[PDB]
C-alpha cells in the first residue's frame, strides 16, 4: 500500500501495526417550568438512550421502570449565603432514597441511567451574583489525610441527597488514631486538584442572577462500561460553585436558596436479587 | 548492497513471535497424519465438558472421594442453604480445580454463561424439591430461602429425572472478568436450598447425595493466556 | 469468529422442560441462557481465537538448562560439555500444558539462549566464545571428549553460536516414527516370555522408543583460556502447527519423574473450605 | 500473499514456516438386552472401522475373525460392597483368555480392534448409589514405590479379566529388597495423578441406580499407530468408580454385583507366527 | 534507509541452511559435465544392490572370507536352525556392515520391505530343500522348524536354480523403525532350517555352502540423516 | 515423490515361480512383497527425498583446524600464520561420505568459524582482531612472513573476518580441470622410462594433480599486542549441486593417510556373533 | 520465482545459488562361444562408444585400430587350487604386450577404450565352488608399508598379464632400507580397505560351477576425463575372488584353471610420437 | 519494522564481491570517454600477440 505524504504490514496482530428564556419540560407525572431559563445543555451533545443490543454485555431481560422512576425529584434546598464556597452532589448516589428509583437501584445489581438536572435559584433585579453548575464525569475528590491516599470511606464519600460542600482552605486530618476518612476538596481547585477556571471543559451552565434563574443539563450515560453497578460507581457529579459572591443593597447578610431537581432518563436495570442494605452512617 | 537500518527490537528473543527459522532437518519426510478419534480444535471445547465440583472441601472430606458428595437428608424443611459457593470459577477453591477452572487458570480474562448441573444420586422413592439460586454481587449473600428467590432461581423436582441445569447468565459491568478473586469483578453467589423437604418412604435410606457439575455454555470465551499456579516445580 | 448471538426470549408456559435432563448418559446438556431466563437480544463480538490450540501453545517454554564450562588450562580438569537427552519432561509447565491431551503432532521451534560468567576470583580475560550445539539422533556416536572426531558434524546438524549475538533458533518438522507423539503409553517394549530368564524382557512400564529422539551435545569450541568461564544454555521450545487428540484431565499433584507416578506426601492438592460459605 | 488481519515463505521446508431406556444389540452369536439402559456413548463420536488402505502401514493380508471374535464376553462379576473404591480393567488385556480372540491376539503380531463395553448393575427401587464408568485411553497408573519410577512389572500391570482395584490411600512399597512392582492407584486421583472430578473429560457414562442399570460404551480404536501389538500396548482402559456409596434400608452390609460384557468390534490382525506364551504369574 | 529488525537466529552458522553466498571466483568458466556411466541420483539406489551378509561372525571366521560362508551338510534331517538373525538391519552385527546397513547407519529412520536372497554354492548333484522363515517380533524366537513355519516362510528347492528370494514384508506398528537396536521398534527374526536334508550321491562333496544377500525393495526409504559409528578419527 | 503403492494380492497357483532366481548374472531380483505373500492394498506416502544426493550431502562438515597466533611483541618469536593445503582428506566423516562414489561434480561452500583465547597467565588486553584468509591457487607465491608482499591479495581472493561477527562464508563453482573430481586415481603422474635415472619418474602411487587446488593462508592482520592471543579457524565445507558417479563400498577400516592404505592392527572391523543366535 | 513446498537469485555467479545359457560373440577375427554362460553384464548399462565431438577435448585426428585391436586376447591361465584367495588384473595394463593394441597404446599419448571381459572356468557336475568377478573402476590397492603411504612403484603396481594375487593376511614390509614398494591387498578387504561383501556394488558376475562356467562383462569407458593416458592411468580392474572354496569328491587337492579373454571395444587414440619404453622390471 | 535475520557471512569483507556502495562524490560530473586507439576488451587479446622466446637462457 503506497500511501501519500510504502506501508506493508508484516505482523498478523493489529497491535503490531504502526501509527430561549422560556422552558417547560415534562417527565412522567412531573412537570418543570421556568420563564427565564437560558436554554439547556445536552452534555456532550448526546441525548440519553436505552441500551442497544449491538453493545449489550449482559443477557438478562432489563427492567425499565419508565414513568415510575423517570420523574423529577427535588433534592433538599441549600442557602447561598455570602460566605459559601459551593456544593457537590454525586449521582445516582443522590437519588438513592428517592421514590422507586432508589428501590430499583438497590434491588437490581446493574443499572444505567441518564439524568436531567434542573438547578433553580431566583433573585430580584437588585441582587448580584452568579453560580456555575458543572456536571463533572467520574468526579473524584481529594482526601483529607496527607499520610494516606484513597482512604475515604463509603459513608463519607456518598453523602446522599444532603450533598457535600467545598472548603475554602485545605486542612489535613491530623488525627492519626481514628482518621475521619472524609473528603476535603478545596473550592478553587475543584477538589480533583485541577483549577476551577478550566472546569468549564466539563458540561456546564451559569446561573447569572441578572439574566437567568435556572440551569438545565441533560447528562447522558458516560462510562467505560455499557452498564455498571449503581451502588458502587457514581457516574456523574454536580458541582455548584459561586463564581461571583452574592450581594444585595449593601447588605452583609443576603441569603437566597438553591434547589436541584434531578430526573433519571432512560434508566435501565438488570440482575435482580436480595436488596442491598448498605452501611451509610 | 541494499541499504537497511536496524530498528529497535532487533536481536531480541520474544517468546511470542511467529518468525520463520531455518530447518535443521531439510527434506525430512514426514509421517502423514491419520484420522485419530477425538481431535480438539479449541480449548473451549474442553471447558464445555461437565466435571464434578468438589463441594465439601471441609476438614476430613477434603482430598477424598467424600469431597464430591453433598449430603441431603429427610429432615423437616429448613431455610438454611444446602450449599453455597461464590461464582469465582478460577479462584473459588471449589471451582478452581474443575476442568473449567483448570482451563481458566491459564487465561486472565473470561466472559460467558455458565451451566451448573446437579444430579440426585438417591433412591427411586426419594421425592422432593430444591431451589437453586444465583444472586449477582453487590448485596448481602443469600443465607435463607427468603433472600435467594429474589435473584435468579430454578425449582428442581427430584421426581424422576435425576438432574437439573441452571444456566448462570452473563451479568457483568465489564466485558470480561479477571480470573483472580477480585472485589471489583465479582461473579456473584450460587446457593442450593430446600424448597420442599426430601420425603422418603419407610424401609428406604434416609440420607441422599447430590453431585454437582460445572461447565461453560456455547457463548463462553477467554483471552490473555497466562501461567497457572496449580503446578510448581519444587526446586 | 463471532460467537453465537444471545437471542431474545420471553415468558413461556410449554411442557418441553429443557431445563431438566439426565446426566446418566454421556452427553452434556446443550442448554443455553435463553432457555431458563428472560434474555434480551445481544450482538456477540467475543471470539475464541486466543484459546485455540495454536494460540494456547504458541509460546516457547524452557525445557532444560545445560551447563558447559571452559576450565583454565592451568587446571588439569577436563572440559565439561553437556549432553542432554531431548525431552519436554525435565520441566513441568510445558509438560503440564501438553499432558492435557493424549496425542499430538506439532512441528517444533527450538531457541538457544546462552549466558556466561567467570568463576575464579582472578578477574582475567576471556575472548568471545563460540558454542557448538550438535544434534545426535538415536544411534549416532555420542561425543566422549570435547575434541574427538564426533564433533565434525559430517551428518549431524549443528549450530555455531557466537556468544553475544541474537539467540540461536531452528525449526524442525514432525519427527515421530508413529503418526502422533505419544504423551502417554500404557504398555512395555518387551513381553516377558514364559521360557526365558526373568532379567530378559524386563522393561520399564510405559517406556517405549516412541519418544526416542536422540541427544543434544553442547560444547565450547574455544580451547581453554587461563581463566575458567562457565556458561548455561537454555532451550526454549515452541510447538508450531500443533494438532492434539484425546483430551485428558490436567495434572493435579506435582510430577515425579517421567511416568505418571506421584510422591508419598504430594497427595493433597485441594484446600479447606466450609460447605456453606461464600 | 497479503493475508487479512504480507506473508512470504523463504524456506523450502514446511517446518520453517510461521504459525432411550430400551436397548438390544447383537454381535455375532451374542445378544444383549437392557430395558432400562440410558442410551449409548459412541466415544469421541467414531464408530469402530476396519483399517482403510489409505492409512495402512503393514502389507500382510489381515485376518479378520469377524463372528468368531466379535462376540460379547462376560468378564467375572465383582461385589459392590459399601466400602469399595473402584475397579479397572485394561483392554484388550482383559480379553486375552476369552475364546478365539485371545488365540488370535497371541498368534498374530499386530492387532487393532474397537470395543463395545456393556456394564450391567441392577438394584431395587429402594437401593441408593451411583457408578461412573470411564473409558480412559492410554490409561496409565502410578507405581507403588517412591524410590523408583516406571518400575511396575508386566505381570502386575496386566491382571487379565480379574481386573484391578483402586486403593483409598496411598501406601509406599517400602520393601527395598524385592519391590512388589505393583500399581497403587489412589481412588480420587484416578491413579494417573489427576483428579476424579475432571475424569469426565474421558468418554463416560453413569449408572445411577434410581434411573438406569446399564451403561454402553462404543470405544473406537485410538492410537498413535494404525495397528500396534496387542500383547504390549493396552489401548483403552475401563475404570468403574462409585461416585456415591451404596446404601439400602439403613442396612450397613448391602452388596450388589457388577458385570462387564466386552465385545471386540472390527478387530483386525497381521503378522502370524509362533504363539506368544508370556509370563503372567 | 529501509527500517529492519534483526529477528532471533541472526549471525548464527547453522550447518543445514541453504543460503546464497558471494562467489569467490567470479566469472570462473566451468568445465562442462560429460556423460560418465553410472550416475547415482539417490542413496536408496545403492541400498537396492545385493551384498553378502557375513553370517558366521563367530570366533575364527570373523574378519575372514570364511565369515561369508554358511556351511550345510549331508547330515540326517534335524529341526535345529541352519542360521538365525534378528531383522535389525542397522544394528544387527551381521547386517550392520552390509551396504544396506552402511547406508542405514547414516539415517535414524527406515521403513520398507527387505529382500533376502540365498545362493547355494554347492555341487550340481546336491539336491534338497530348505525353509526360510521370517517371524515378526513379540513372541519366542523360533528355534525349531515347528515354530518357524507359523510365521512367513518360503520353501527353497535346491534342484537347479541356485538362488531363492524371501521378501520380508513391512510389518510394523510405527511407520518407521529406529536404526538402533531397540525393544519397542524391533524388526523380527529370520531363520533358515532344513525342510528336507541335502542328499548328495557318492563320489560327491558332502559339505555345501550357501551365501546370503540382503537388499532393499523398491518401497524402501530412510530419513533424518545422522552420523555413522562405523568410522572413528582416532585422536 | 510418492513411492509405489503396495498393490493387493491373493492366493495363486501359477508356474511363473518369480521367487526363484539366479544370482550368477549381475542383475538383482526385482521381486516385490506382493509376489511371495498375500498383500493388502496400501496407499503409499513415504518419499525418498531425504535420501537424495543433495540431502545426503547438504550439510557442512569440518575439514581442518588452522592455528594462528599473535605473539606478544615482548617475545621475539615470530607470528604463526597457518598455511593449509586444500583437501577433504584431513578428516574422516566427509571423506567417508564422499568415498561412497568414485567421481563427483559439486560446487562448494566454505564457512570459517574463528575462535580466540589468551595464553599467558597475564590477563592483559587485546583489541578485536581481524583475520585475513587468502586463497593461493597452485603456483601463486606462498607467503613466508606474515607481513610480506604476497598478502596484498592483488589477484588472490581473500576474506577479512572481524572476530566476533557472523562466521565468514563464500561459495565456489566446480574448479576441477577434469570433468569430475577424482576421489580415486589408479596410476601415477610419471612413467619411469627405461632409459633414465631411477629417481626421475618416481612418483607416489595414485597421486595426481587432479586434486591440486592450492593452499589457504590465514593470518592475524593486527600487529602483535603485549599479550599473546591464539586462534583456531575451523573450515566447514558444504557440497552444493552435487552429482556423483560410479558408487563404491564404504570404508570399513580406519583411514591411513591420503591413499587407500590401512594400518597393521586396524584390520578387524566386524564383531563376534554366533551363527545361530538372534 | 515462487516455488512450491520466494526464491530470488541475487548473485550473478551460479555457484552462489542455494541448493540365457547360450552365448556367442564375435569381435574382429576372434569368436567366443559358451553354451552355459549366464548372460552378460553391461556394466552401468552403457555400451562402449566412440568419442563424440560434443565432448571432445583434443583436436588431433583419432586413430581407431578397429579390427586390428578390438580382438579377444586370452591372458595366461591360473590354477584355482583350494587354498587360493584371488587374483586381480588392471586394465589396459594387462593388454600392454598383446598384439597391436600394446603398440598403439605405447605409441599414442592419449587413449580411451571399453572392454569385453570373458572369464572362463569349467568344472564337472561333481565339482563344488563359486567365483566372483568384479570390474572395479579406478581400482586402487593398499600398500605394504605402514611407515609410508602411496609408496608403491610403477613396476610392482602394473604386473601386466601375469596379474596379481590377494593375500590372506596383511604383512607389513618391515624392511626400512630398501622397501619393496609392493601391493599387499588383503583378500576379504578387497585391497581398497572396504569389505568384500559390499564389493557387489561394482559391476560383477558370479561363476557358480553348478550353474554356469563363464562370465561376460561389457565395461564402458568410465573416467573423469574423456580421453586419458593409458600408460599412467588404469581405468578399470578385474578382481576374481572365490566366494566358496573349491571342493571335489572329498579330494584335498582339486585344481581347475581359470582363463580371461579381454577384447578392447571402441578403442580410440590420439597424440602420436616416439614410442614409450617404460621400466617394468 | 521489517523482520530480518542476519545469515552467516554478514559484516565480512570479501575482496571478490560485487556489492553496491554509497558514492562519496555525489552528482560528480564525469569527463566523457573519447575514442582512444587501442582498446583491449579481454586479456586473451594480449596473449595472441607474438613475442620473442628467450631461448638461450644459458650462462653468458
Ligand atoms: C542443536 C542444533 C540442531 C538441532 C536439530 C533439532 C533438534 C530436535 C530434533 C528432535 C525433536 C523431536 C522431539 C521434540 C518433540 C517432543 O519430544 O515432544
Ligand atoms: C579464503 C578466501 C577465499 C577462498 C576461495 C575459495 C577456496 C576454495 C577453492 C578451491 C576449492 C576446490 C577443492 C574443493 C573440492 C575438493 O577438493 O573435493
Q: Using CA atoms, how far apart are residues C35 and C19, in angstroms rounded to an integer?
A: 7
CA–CA distance, A258 with A76 (Å, rounded to integer): 9
Cell of C128: 568471545
What is the Cα–Cα distance from C252 to A262, expressed in whole angstroms? 56
DSSP for F217-237 reads EEEE-SPP-SS-EEEEEEEEE
Q: How far is the CA of B31 from the centre of ligand 1 (A)?
A: 16
Q: Which helix (H) or strand (E) holds A228?
A: strand A228-229
Chain mean position to CA A42:
14
d(CA A180, CA D94): 75
Q: Does E19 touch chain C (CB under 8 A)?
A: no
Q: What are the backbone angles phi and psi of residue E176, rounded to the nearest 5°?
A: -140, 160
- The DSSP code for F26 is S
- Nearest-neighbour CA in chain D from C166: distance (Å): 18
DSSP letter, residue D200: G
Compare all CA atoms of chain B with the CA of A110 and give the residue at the minimum distance: B173
Please name the residue ranges forming H helices in chain E: 44-47, 93-96, 99-104, 145-148
Q: For a pocket test of ligand 2, which of F63, F176, F216 has the largest count of ligand atoms closer than 8 A to its C-beta?
A: F216
Contact E221 B29 (CB under 8 A): yes
Q: Map residue B45 onto helix, strand or coil.
A: helix
CB contact under 8 A, D274 and E137: no
User: How remote is the CA of residue E182 from the centroid of ligand 1, in Å?
Assistant: 19
E158: which residues sit within 8 A by CB, 6+ positions away? E120, E122, E126, E127, E128, E129, E130, E198
Closest to E226 in 3D by CA, of E77, E100, E104:
E104
Q: Quick check: F24 and G133 in contact, CB under 8 A?
A: no
Convert D130-147 to b/e letters by CB count within 10 Å (16 or more is b): bbbbbbbbbbbbbbbbbe
Query: Nine-digit cell at F177?
Result: 580441470
Please classify residue C233 by burial: count the beta carbons closer than 10 Å to its beta carbon, then call 0-12 exposed, 13-18 middle and 19+ buried.
buried
Measure Cα distances from C233 to C66, C99, C116, C240 in Å.
5, 25, 9, 22
Q: Is the peptide bond before G143 cis (omega within 30 degrees of 0)?
A: no
Query: What span, in angstroms and rounded, lies between the C-alpha atoms of C180 and G208?
Result: 50
**CA-to-CA distance for B63 and C272, rounded, in angstroms?**
9
Other residues' Cβ atoms within 10 Å of the Cβ of residue A126 = 9
Q: What is the DSSP string of B165-195?
A: EEEE----SSSSEESS--STT---EEEEEEE
Question: Could you report how far apart the first and last alpha carbons of chain B are, in Å?
Answer: 51
Q: Chain C: give the shortest CA distance to residue E147, in Å.
A: 14
Closest-CA residue to E176 (of E128, E129, E224): E224
Closest to E96 in 3D by CA, of E229, E234, E235, E201: E229
> What residues contact H55, with CB distance under 8 A and at least 6 apart?
none
Cis-peptide into D92, omega within 30 deg? yes
- Whether residue D137 contacts residue D222, with contact meaning beta carbons closer than 8 Å, is answered with yes
Which residue on chain D is closest to B122 by alpha carbon? D128
The three grid cell numbers given for residue D159, joined into one nine-digit string: 491382571
Touch between chain C and chain G: 3 or more Cβ pairs under 8 Å: no
C-alpha cell belonging to residue C21: 435432563
* CB-based contact E147 D225, cutoff 8 Å: no
Distance F174 CA to ligand 2 centre (A): 9
Q: Which three cell numbers stand for residue G180?
A: 619393496
User: Resolution of the deposited coordinates, in angstroms?
Assistant: 3.3
Compute the distance between CA of residue G164 and CA of residue G162 in angstroms, rounded to an integer.
7
Query: How far is the CA of C195 from the CAs of C7, C200, C201, E78, in angstroms?
Result: 70, 10, 11, 22
C86 Cα–ligand 1 center, Å: 6
How many other CB atoms are found less than 10 A from the CB of residue F189? 16
DSSP G51-65: PPGGG----SPPB--
Residues 6+ apart with CB under 8 A from B118: B130, B132, B156, B163, B164, B166, B192, B210, B211, B212, B213
Tell me which H or E stretch contains F57: helix F53-57
Partner A contacted by D1 (CB < 8 A): no
What's the sign of the alpha-carbon dihedral C147, C152, C156, C159?
A: positive
Distance CA C249, CA B103 (A): 10
Q: How far is CA B55 from CA B61, B93, B123, C276, in A?
A: 10, 9, 21, 9
From the list A36, A22, A116, A94, the residue with the least C-alpha distance to A280 is: A94
Maximum CA pair distance of chain G? 75
Cell of C242: 500443533
For F55, list phi and psi in degrees, rounded to 5.
Answer: -65, -25
Q: How far is the CA of E22 from the centre of ligand 2 (A)?
A: 13
| Residue C255 CB less than 6 A away from ligand 1 | no
Please list the residues that pair with C12 across neighbouring strands.
none
How far apart are alpha carbons C220 and C70 in whole angstroms?
7
Which residue spans within F173-274 are E strands per DSSP?
Answer: 181-182, 215-220, 229-247
Task: Decide if B19 and E9 are in contact by the 8 Å CB cutoff.
Answer: yes
Q: Name the percent of chain E in helix, strand, coil, to the closest 5.
A: 10, 30, 60
| The three three-digit cell numbers of residue F173, written as one number | 563453482
Q: Is F211 helix (H, G, I), strand (E, B) or coil?
A: helix
Nearest residue of chain A to residue H2 (CA atoms): A10
3-state secondary structure of E52: coil
Q: What is the β-pairing status of strands G78-79 and G164-165?
A: unpaired
Method underlying the structure: cryo-EM
The three three-digit cell numbers of residue F106, written as one number: 559439486
Cα distance between residue G189 and residue G197, in whole Å? 9
- At a CB cut-off of 8 Å and minimum separation 6, what does F224 contact? F70, F71, F72, F73, F79
Ligand 1: centre distance to CA C201 (Å): 29
For chain G, give me the number of helices (H) and strands (E)?
2, 14
CB atoms within 10 A of CB F190: 12
Closest by CA to A185, choosing from A202, A167, A197, A163, is A167
CA–CA dist B175, A58 (Å, integer): 9
Nearest to B164 by CA among B50, B62, B84: B50
Q: Which three cell numbers stand for residue C171?
A: 525449526
Closest CA to C178 of C170, C169, C187: C187
Phi, psi angles (nearest 5°) of residue C96:
-70, -40
Quick one: which ligand is closest to B25's CA? 1
Pairwise CA distance, residues B108 & B180, whole Å: 8
What F81-85 contacts at long range (C-beta under 8 Å, 24+ apart), as own/partner pairs, is F81/F143, F81/F146, F81/F217, F81/F218, F81/F219, F81/F220, F82/F217, F82/F218, F82/F219, F82/F233, F83/F142, F83/F143, F83/F215, F83/F216, F83/F217, F84/F215, F84/F216, F84/F217, F84/F218, F84/F235, F85/F214, F85/F215, F85/F216
H helices of F104-254, where?
A: none
CA distance E92 to A91: 87
Task: Answer left, alpha or beta for residue G45, where phi above 0 means left and psi between -120 and 50 means alpha.
Answer: left
How far is Cα C129 from Cα H6, in angstroms, rounded to an integer? 19
Find out whether F31 and E115 touch, Cβ atoms under 8 Å.
yes
- Least CA distance to E9: which residue of chain B? B21
Chain F: closest CA distance from residue D230 (Å)? 20
C-alpha dihedral over C201, C207, C210, C214, to 10 degrees? -100
Q: Which residues of F touch G153 (CB under 8 A)?
A: 192, 202, 205
CA dist list (Å): D192 to B67, C185, D166: 19, 12, 11
Is the Cβ pair A61, C43 closer than 8 Å? no
Contact flag H4-E2 (C-beta cutoff 8 Å)? no
CA F275 to CA E81: how far, in whole Å? 10
Residues in chain G: 281
Interior CA angle at A94 toward A89 and A97, to 5°? 155
Report which of D236, D233, D272 is spatially closest to residue D154, judged by C-alpha positions.
D233
Enumerate the residues of chain C whose CB falls inside 8 A of the CB of residue F164: 128, 162, 164
| Alpha-carbon distance G216 to nearest alpha carbon in chain E (angstroms) | 18
User: Residues 6 or more apart from G183 whose CB is under 8 A from it?
Assistant: G141, G142, G143, G144, G152, G156, G157, G164, G191
Three-state SS at A33 = strand
Chains linked to B by 3 or more Cβ pairs within 8 Å: A, C, D, E, F, H
Q: Nine-digit cell at C51?
A: 484459546
Most B CBs within 10 Å: which of E178, E219, E223, E224, as the mutation test of the B interface? E223
Burial of A61 (0-12, 13-18, 19+ CB in 10 A): middle
d(CA C263, CA C256): 6
Instruction: Tell me if C61 sits within 8 A of C94, measured CB to CB.
Output: yes
Q: Could you give the count of Cα atoms lying within 13 Å of B105 in the half-sphere of its Cβ?
A: 21
Could C51 and B58 be called an inter-chain contact, meaning their C-beta atoms sit closer than 8 Å? no
Closest C-alpha to B20, from G19, E10, C105, D19 = D19
Which stretches of B50-113 are assigned E, i.e. beta strand? 70-71, 83-86, 107-110
**Assigned C-alpha cell, A48:** 440519553
Breaks (C-N over 2.5 A) in chain A follow: 5, 19
CB-based contact G239:G44 (threshold 8 Å)? no
**Cβ contact (<8 Å) for B27 and F52?**
yes
Compute the nearest-CA separation of D4 from chain G (Å): 20
Whether the Cβ atoms of residue B218 and residue C4 lie closer than 8 Å to each other? yes
Contact G142 F259 (CB under 8 A): yes
DSSP of A194-206: S-TGGGGGSSEEE
Q: Which ligand is nearest to the CA of C137?
A: 1
Strand order in the sheet with B114-120: B70-71, B209-216, B114-120, B163-168
Rounded to whole angstroms, what are the CA distances from G95 to C248, G16, G161? 78, 46, 7
Q: Which residue of G has its CA nearest to D17?
A: G5
Q: Is C187 left (phi over 0), alpha (psi -120 to 50) or beta?
A: left
Mutational pocket test of ligand 1: of C84, C138, C175, C235, the residue with most ligand atoms within 8 Å of the beta carbon: C175
| A/G Cβ contact: 3+ pairs below 8 Å | no
**F158-162: strand order across its sheet:** F82-85, F215-220, F130-136, F158-162, H13-14
Show Cβ contacts of residue D175 under 8 Å, excluding neighbours closer than 6 positions. Answer: none
Distance CA D230, CA D109 (A): 8
Q: Does D13 touch chain F (CB under 8 A)?
A: no
Could you give the C-alpha distances from E30 to E35, F137, F171, F175, in angstroms and in order? Answer: 16, 16, 14, 7
- Residue G13 to residue G1: CA distance in whole angstroms: 18
Contact predicate G131/G241, CB 8 Å: yes
- For chains D and G, what is the number of CB pairs under 8 angstroms? 9
Rounded Cα gap, residues C214 and C211, in angstroms = 9
Query: Contact at 8 Å (CB) between B153 and B127?
Result: no
**Cα F25 to chain center, whole Å?**
35
Tell me which of C158, C172, C184, C219 to substitute to probe ligand 1's pocket, judged by most ligand atoms within 8 Å of the beta carbon: C172
As given in the structure block, the three cell numbers for residue G172 are: 607389513
Contact C225, C70 (CB under 8 A): yes
Interchain contact B176–A (C-beta under 8 A): no
Q: What is the 3-state secondary structure (H, E, C) of A204-225?
A: EEEEECCCCCEEEEEECCCCCC
Residues of C in contact with B230 (CB under 8 A): 250, 252, 269
Nearest-angstrom CA–CA distance, D114 and D51: 11
Please state, in angstroms and rounded to a whole number, the distance separating the CA atoms of residues F146 and F77.
Answer: 12
Ligand 1 near C173 CB (within 6 A): no
Distance CA G238, CA G243 (A): 15
Burial of A128 (0-12, 13-18, 19+ CB in 10 A): middle
Distance from CA of F127 to the nearest CA of H (A): 18
Residue partners of D161: CB distance under 8 A and separation at least 6: D75, D76, D89, D94, D95, D96, D97, D98
Q: Which of F172, F174, F217, F236 to mutate to test the pocket of ligand 2 (most atoms within 8 A of CB)?
A: F172
Among candidates B164, E13, G58, which has minimal Cα distance to F235? Answer: E13
> D91 burial class (0-12, 13-18, 19+ CB within 10 angstroms)?
buried
CA angle, corner B104, sides to B99 and B106, nearest 5?
110
Residues of H in contact with F218 (CB under 8 A): none
C-alpha span between G57 and C68 (Å, rounded): 57
- Residue E30 — φ and ψ, nearest 5°? -110, 130
List all residues 6 or more positions away from G93 whose beta carbon is below 8 Å from its beta carbon.
G158, G159, G160, G234
Output b/e per residue, G213-238; b: 16+ Cβ within 10 A.
bbbbbbbbbbbbbbbbbbbbbbbbbb
Amino acid at each position: 500500500q503506497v500511501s501519500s505524504q510504502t506501508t506493508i504490514n508484516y505482523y498478523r496482530d493489529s497491535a503490531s501495526n504502526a501509527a430561549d428564556r422560556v422552558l417547560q419540560l415534562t417527565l412522567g407525572n412531573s412537570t418543570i417550568t421556568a420563564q427565564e431559563a437560558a436554554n439547556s445543555v445536552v452534555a456532550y451533545g448526546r441525548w440519553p438512550e436505552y441500551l442497544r443490543d449491538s453493545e449489550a454485555n449482559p443477557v438478562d431481560q432489563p427492567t425499565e421502570p419508565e414513568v415510575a422512576a423517570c420523574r423529577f425529584y427535588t433534592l433538599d434546598t441549600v442557602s447561598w449565603t455570602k460566605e459559601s464556597r459551593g456544593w457537590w452532589w454525586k449521582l445516582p448516589d443522590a437519588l438513592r432514597d428517592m421514590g422507586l428509583f432508589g428501590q430499583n437501584m438497590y434491588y437490581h445489581y446493574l443499572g444505567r441511567s441518564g439524568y436531567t438536572v434542573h438547578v433553580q435559584c431566583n433573585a430580584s433585579k437588585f441582587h448580584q451574583g452568579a453560580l456555575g453548575v458543572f456536571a463533572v464525569p467520574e468526579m473524584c475528590l481529594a482526601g483529607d489525610s496527607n499520610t494516606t491516599t484513597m482512604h475515604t470511606s463509603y459513608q463519607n464519600a456518598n453523602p446522599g441527597e444532603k450533598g457535600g460542600t467545598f472548603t475554602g482552605t485545605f486542612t489535613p486530618d491530623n488525627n492519626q488514631t481514628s482518621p475521619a476518612r472524609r473528603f476535603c476538596p478545596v473550592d478553587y481547585l475543584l477538589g480533583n486538584g485541577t483549577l476551577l477556571g478550566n472546569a468549564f471543559v466539563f458540561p456546564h451552565q451559569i446561573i447569572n442572577l441578572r439574566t437567568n434563574n435556572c440551569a438545565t443539563l441533560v447528562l447522558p450515560y458516560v462510562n467505560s462500561l455499557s452498564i455498571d453497578s449503581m451502588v458502587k460507581h457514581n457516574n456523574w457529579g454536580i458541582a455548584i460553585l459561586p463564581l461571583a459572591p452574592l450581594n444585595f443593597a449593601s447588605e452583609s447578610s443576603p441569603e437566597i436558596p438553591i434547589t436541584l431537581t434531578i430526573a433519571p432518563m432512560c434508566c435501565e436495570f438488570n440482575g435482580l436479587r436480595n436488596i442491598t442494605l448498605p452501611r451509610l452512617q | 548492497g541494499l541499504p537497511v537500518m536496524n530498528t529497535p527490537g532487533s536481536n531480541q528473543y520474544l517468546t511470542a513471535d511467529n518468525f520463520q527459522s531455518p530447518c535443521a532437518l531439510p527434506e525430512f519426510d514426514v509421517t502423514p497424519p491419520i484420522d485419530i478419534p477425538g481431535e480438539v480444535k479449541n480449548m473451549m471445547e474442553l471447558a464445555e465438558i461437565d466435571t464434578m465440583i468438589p463441594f465439601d472441601l471441609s476438614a476430613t472430606k477434603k482430598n477424598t472421594m467424600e469431597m464430591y458428595r453433598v449430603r441431603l437428608s429427610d429432615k423437616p424443611h429448613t431455610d438454611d442453604p444446602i450449599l453455597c459457593l461464590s461464582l469465582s470459577p478460577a479462584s473459588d477453591p471449589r471451582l478452581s480445580h474443575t476442568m473449567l477452572g483448570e482451563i481458566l487458570n491459564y487465561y486472565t480474562h473470561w466472559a460467558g454463561s455458565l451451566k451448573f448441573t446437579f444430579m440426585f444420586c438417591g433412591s427411586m422413592m426419594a421425592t422432593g424439591k430444591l431451589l437453586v439460586s444465583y444472586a449477582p454481587p453487590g448485596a448481602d449473600p443469600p443465607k435463607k430461602r427468603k433472600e435467594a428467590m429474589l435473584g435468579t432461581h430454578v425449582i428442581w423436582d427430584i421426581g424422576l429425572q435425576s438432574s437439573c441445569t441452571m444456566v448462570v447468565p452473563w451479568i457483568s459491568n465489564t466485558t470480561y472478568r479477571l480470573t483472580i478473586d477480585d472485589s471489583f469483578t465479582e461473579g456473584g453467589y450460587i446457593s442450593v436450598f430446600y424448597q420442599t423437604r426430601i420425603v422418603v418412604p419407610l424401609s428406604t435410606p434416609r440420607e441422599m447425595d447430590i453431585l454437582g457439575f460445572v461447565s461453560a455454555c456455547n457463548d463462553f470465551s477467554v483471552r490473555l493466556l497466562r501461567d497457572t499456579t496449580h503446578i510448581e516445580q519444587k526446586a | 469468529d463471532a460467537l453465537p448471538n444471545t437471542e431474545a426470549s420471553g415468558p413461556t408456559h410449554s411442557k418441553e422442560i429443557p431445563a431438566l435432563t439426565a446426566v446418566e448418559t454421556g452427553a452434556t446438556n446443550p442448554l443455553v441462557p435463553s432457555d431458563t431466563v428472560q434474555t434480551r437480544h445481544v450482538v456477540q463480538h467475543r471470539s475464541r481465537s486466543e484459546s485455540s490450540i495454536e494460540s494456547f501453545f504458541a509460546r516457547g517454554a524452557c525445557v532444560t538448562i545445560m551447563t558447559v564450562d571452559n576450565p583454565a588450562s592451568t587446571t588439569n580438569k577436563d572440559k565439561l560439555f553437556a549432553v542432554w537427552k531431548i525431552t519436554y519432561k525435565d520441566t513441568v509447565q510445558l509438560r503440564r500444558k501438553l499432558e492435557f491431551f493424549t496425542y499430538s503432532r506439532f512441528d517444533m521451534e527450538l531457541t538457544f539462549v546462552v549466558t556466561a560468567n567467570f568463576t575464579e576470583t582472578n578477574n582475567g580475560h576471556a575472548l568471545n566464545q563460540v558454542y557448538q550445539i550438535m544434534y545426535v539422533p538415536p544411534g549416532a556416536p555420542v561425543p566422549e571428549k570435547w575434541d574427538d572426531y564426533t564433533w565434525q558434524t559430517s551428518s549431524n546438524p549443528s549450530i555455531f553460536y557466537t556468544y553475544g549475538t541474537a539467540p540461536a533458533r531452528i525449526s524442525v518438522p514432525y519427527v515421530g516414527i508413529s503418526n502422533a507423539y505419544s504423551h502417554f503409553y500404557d504398555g512395555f517394549s518387551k513381553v516377558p516370555l514364559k521360557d526365558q530368564s526373568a532379567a530378559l524382557g524386563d522393561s520399564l512400564y510405559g517406556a517405549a522408543s516412541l519418544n526416542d529422539f536422540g541427544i543434544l551435545a553442547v560444547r565450547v569450541v574455544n580451547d581453554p583460556n587461563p581463566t575458567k568461564v562457565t556458561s548455561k544454555i537454555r532451550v526454549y521450545l515452541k510447538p508450531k502447527h500443533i494438532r492434539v487428540w484425546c483430551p485428558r484431565p490436567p495434572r493435579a499433584v506435582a510430577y515425579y519423574g517421567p511416568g505418571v507416578d506421584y510422591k508419598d506426601g504430594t497427595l493433597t492438592p485441594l484446600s479447606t473450605k466450609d460447605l456453606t460459605t461464600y
